[PDB]
Amino acid sequence: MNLNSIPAFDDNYIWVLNDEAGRCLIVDPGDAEPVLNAIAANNWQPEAIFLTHHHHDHVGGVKELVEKFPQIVVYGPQETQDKGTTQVVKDGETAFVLGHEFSVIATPGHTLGHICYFSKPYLFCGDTLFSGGCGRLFEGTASQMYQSLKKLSALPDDTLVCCAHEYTLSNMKFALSILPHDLSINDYYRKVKELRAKNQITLPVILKNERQINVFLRTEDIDLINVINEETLLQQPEERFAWLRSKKDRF
Ligand SMILES: [Cl-]
Ligand SMILES: [Cl-]
Ligand SMILES: [Zn+2]
Ligand SMILES: [Zn+2]
Numbered sequence: 001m002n003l004n005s006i007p008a009f010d011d012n013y014i015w016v017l018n019d020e021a022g023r024c025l026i027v028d029p030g031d032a033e034p035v036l037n038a039i040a041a042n043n044w045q046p047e048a049i050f051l052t053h054h055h056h057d058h059v060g061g062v063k064e065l066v067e068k069f070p071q072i073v074v075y076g077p078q079e080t081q082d083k084g085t086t087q088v089v090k091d092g093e094t095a096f097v098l099g100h101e102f103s104v105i106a107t108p109g110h111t112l113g114h115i116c117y118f119s120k121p122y123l124f125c126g127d128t129l130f131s132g133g134c135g136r137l138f139e140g141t142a143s144q145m146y147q148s149l150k151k152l153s154a155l156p157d158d159t160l161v162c163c164a165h166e167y168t169l170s171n172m173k174f175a176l177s178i179l180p181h182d183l184s185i186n187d188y189y190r191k192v193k194e195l196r197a198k199n200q201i202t203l204p205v206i207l208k209n210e211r212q213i214n215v216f217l218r219t220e221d222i223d224l225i226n227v228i229n230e231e232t233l234l235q236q237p238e239e240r241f242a243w244l245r246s247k248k249d250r251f
């Protein structure tokens, strides 16, 4: 398969995988217009849409896409049944698309019903995991997001993190506000700053690298533990997650 990105709105990406014949899988199409344009420009043959969660910026384009291409199957969680899903998927299920079996992983936190899709190496993790960050907890608890990120981080090292928003630079500025001396975070911040200064996409990222630069994946890293403890004594990695997530909310 071949990966493509379609920008939408201010900072969304609509990921598309295509096979050699041009059949395609479209992930979280919040705006149909750039998707329809890309389908036509590339002569793609739409097969499926994957939805990760119910927010407008991920689902708004479904109706128009399926009107133009009624053959599309729309896979999504129960919380998207009223957003155009025609095949519900749940934790531990799979969807067979473009000749590949995608695993479905429930990741409550950003929304309660958020799911991620994985077919090695591609991880479509929506708004759960971002490069350098994680989703805001609009519906779920910090415990849920902590457990969700633990599952995603346990995927293979070569996983390509295909998240939905170009938030990487802001995420790294937050990281430096917590760990200003951390060399890996500083180096990745500079790389990202330069990509964005040239208007270049920062995604996808390799999970092995991501774990080293993402404070939300580092709650057992002694360096982060120690810096947090200079302000608030915390012994549980899950507590460090909630402390970080609340700090980021205010940043
Ligand atoms: Cl809104
Ligand atoms: Cl978010
Ligand atoms: Zn393959
Ligand atoms: Zn969202």
Ligand SMILES: [Zn+2]
Pocket: 056, 057
């Ligand atoms: Zn909104």
Ligand SMILES: [Zn+2]
Pocket: 055, 057, 058, 127, 164, 165
């Ligand atoms: Zn979003």
